[PDB]
Structure formats: C-alpha cells, structure tokens
C-alpha cells in the first residue's frame, strides 16, 4: 500500500491542457551522469513522482457525464465519464500567421456609401407564371437559359438595319450573357489587384 502523497521542496507547476508538469527542483549531476549505474533508477523515480502528481491533478479535475446512448452523434456514451481539461497555459508559435481581413471591394464601398443592405438569399427558386411550376433562376436547368430552348422568338425592330439581323437571337443572347460573365470575372480580378 504505497502512498500517493509526494512531498517536494519546490512546488511542481502544471499545464493540464497539454498534460504537462514542470518541476524546477535541484538536479544532481552525480546521480544522472553516465558514470553512475543508478541513473536509470533516479530518473525513473523522479518521473514516477512527477507523473503521480500529474495524475492526481487530472483525477482532481472536474468530470463531464452524459445520458445519451451509443450509436448517436457526439462520441460520448452514458457510461463514459470524461475529464474537463482547462485551456493550455504554455504559449507555442503557430504554423501559419493569422488570416488578414480582406480589403473592401468597390461594390462593398459603394453599397456602404449608398446604404444598400445585403440581400436575404432565401433560395434559388422562382415561380414561372407561364407555367405552373417553380424553377431555379440560374444554374442547372435554370430559368435564365430558357430563351435558348424557346421554340419561337420575335425579332426585335432595333436589330433591323444592321448586319446582325441574320444571326439567331438565341446565339446573340448567349454571347451577351458570356460577355457579362467575363466582365464580372474581369471586375473580380481588378478587385483582387487593387
């Protein structure tokens, strides 16, 4: 029945978040040098005392219990009792710097100046009055590409008198959409540059 009460001159400090213990007591070079054959015993005894103190602190930490069963999300079962580790005290350098805040774009500055609050983004579904169905407003089977599949398109009077009359209006609208998309891409690239 060996005791679990370790008496130390210098009090050991604990970082329970990292499960680490630090003792700054006096270490003798004679008992730890390679010339002494009891160095392993000395190191094992000191480490045993430090680990005993660390385990005492860990078992004195507060404990979390739950009532949920196995097979559920969370990873903790009712029979499992966990320790609540505090935040680590030791400060260590990060592997990467903190992410810098992105500079405000031209649109963001304009919206802030004009008091334009952002849209609510409820969803991508809009009601088609010509039919009785809800359709996406963009993307896969979006409503913005219905003119390409439209069976009959009236030719505009403004296109008359130009050489572009013989072109399919569906092709012209696809070209205009691609031009708008490329303009948006160019504006994004410009915002990245600035």
């Amino acid at each position: 029945n060996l005791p679990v009460t370790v008496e130390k001159p210098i009090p050991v400090v604990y970082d329970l978040g990292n499960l680490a213990a630090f003792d700054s007591n006096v270490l003798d070079k004679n008992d730890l040098d390679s010339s002494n054959a009891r160095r392993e015993e000395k190191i094992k005894s000191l480490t045993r005392d430090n680990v005993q103190l660390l385990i005492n602190q860990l078992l004195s930490l507060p404990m979390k219990t739950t009532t949920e069963s196995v097979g559920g999300t969370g990873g903790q079962s009712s029979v499992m009792t966990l320790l609540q580790l505090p935040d680590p005290t030791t400060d260590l350098p990060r592997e990467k710097p903190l992410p810098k805040a992105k500079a405000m774009t031209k649109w963001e500055k304009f919206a802030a100046k004009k008091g334009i609050k952002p849209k609510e983004r409820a969803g991508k579904m809009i009601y088609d009055e010509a039919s009785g169905e809800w359709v996406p407003k963009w993307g896969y089977k979006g409503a913005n590409k219905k003119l390409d599949d439209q069976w009959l398109v009236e030719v505009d009077d403004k296109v008359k008198g130009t050489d572009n009359e013989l072109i399919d209006p569906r092709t012209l609208n696809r070209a205009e959409r691609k031009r708008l998309v490329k303009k948006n891409e160019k504006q994004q690239r410009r915002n990245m540059k600035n």
């Binding site: 029945n1 060996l2 005791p3 679990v4 009460t5 978040g17 990292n18 499960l19 680490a20 213990a21 630090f22 003792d23 700054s24 007591n25 006096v26 270490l27 003798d28 070079k29 004679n30 730890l32 040098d33 390679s34 392993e40 190191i43 094992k44 000191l46 480490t47 045993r48 430090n50 680990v51 005993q52 660390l54 385990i55 005492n56 860990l58 078992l59 979390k64 903790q76 499992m80 009792t81 966990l82 320790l83 609540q84 580790l85 935040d87 680590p88 030791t90 400060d91 260590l92 350098p93 990060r94 592997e95 990467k96 710097p97 903190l98 992410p99």
Partner: protein, 268 residues
Amino acid sequence: NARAKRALVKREAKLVENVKQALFIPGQSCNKNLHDIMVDLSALKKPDMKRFNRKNDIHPFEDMSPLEFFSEKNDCSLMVLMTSSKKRKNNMTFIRTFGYKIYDMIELMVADNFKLLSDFKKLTFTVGLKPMFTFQGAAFDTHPVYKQIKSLFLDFFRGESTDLQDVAGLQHVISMTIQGDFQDGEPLPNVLFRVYKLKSYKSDQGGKRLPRIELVEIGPRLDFKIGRIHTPSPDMVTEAHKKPKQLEMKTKKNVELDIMGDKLGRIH
C-alpha cells in the same frame, strides 16, 4: 478539381490550426542508428508524420531554401533532418517553421549509449493517443536554450488539442530531464529523453479515487547534446504568438452571463 480546392482550403491558414505535421528527411550521410531512431520518433509522432527515404544534401546552417521548399510542398511545419559527420555524429536537426519560412532551428547529437524501441521488448501504447509530459530542470523555465527545447518538444509531441479527455487513453509519458544543474560559463548539459508506460494499483491510502502509479520504460532512451542553435526574430515571435480573439466573446464592463443564459447589467 473540387478535391484540389478542398486540399488548398485545408492547407490555408485558419483561426484554429490543425495538428502540426512532421517530415523526417535523411541527409547525404545516414546510418542504421539514425534510421532506427527516426523510425522510433516517427512511431511516436504518427499519424502526423511523413517520412522521406532518399538522401538529401541539406545543410540547414548554410542554406534554408530546400527546407522551405519541402515545407511548402508537404505542409509540414516540423522538420527532422538526420545526418552524420565526424564532427557531428548522429546529428538530428529539428526545424520548426512559421508560414513556410524558417522560424527556429535546433541541432542535437545523439549519444552512443542509446537503446532502440526493440531493445526493451515490452507492451506499448495504442497508436495515436496524446502523451503526458514531464520536464526536469529549472533551465526549462530560466535558460533560453532549454526554453526553446521545451517549446519545441511540447509542440512536436502535443498532438491534437481537446477539452475532453478519456481516462483510458492516458498511457505513456515523455520525460525530458536536464543532466544536473549547471552555471554560467559551463558547457550545456545533455538532455535525457525517455518514454514510460503507466500502471495503476490500489493504494489503500488515497481511497478508490487515487491509485498508486508505476512506470515501465518503453524506449527509446536518448541523450541529446546541444550542438547548434538558431533563434527567431522578435517580430516573428510576436507574429507567431498573436491570438485571433474572434471566436471568444468580447469582455464588457458590468455585463455578465448567468447560469440561465440571461445577459445581466450591473448599476452602481
């Protein structure tokens, strides 16, 4: 393409960083002792370890660009370069990098009286559980070199951070002890690195809540002599020790949150 985007997002910086990964790089000259020590350290580090196999002409204190290139290519913030020389026998260089640039480097030499993992032939711990740490020596808190050693080893073997710990996972402890107290103007004492496995028994004096602890040595046992050092710049130290402070609630005077979750204000 979406897999590539996911990899890039995983590699990019974040408020809560991932577990630091360690790359083990052999040098131009390597030995079987170095290979076995590297294997044992990689076993202690896994599954946060990547190992190269070929020989690499790397001199950290003459150039840094190959190390920086490897760190950026592999997303490994920890580097262990193993080399040999007549002046430096069994040299392990630990390079910790901040932002794909050399943050700090230490260079230790392994003494000859070392025993590998297979010498002990004892039952060991399950793969992938965080260890406990013990550090013996006031120089860990006072001397800058041992400050760097303690920070490097805690960062290297800390693993995944968590707020909840299962008691069945507390299996092994890494002990780093200074070979006796020293004074100014003396050679730096070697650092002794040991690994122990825990055993518990009824104590009959601390009740049924405090068991008597015992240790069984696992290995490897290593003695590191401090050959070379390379410290970071103060501004780099500050930039690496900056805190995000975004996730936590801002503290406001006379405003508290009670147990029910109501926001309460104090008047005087």
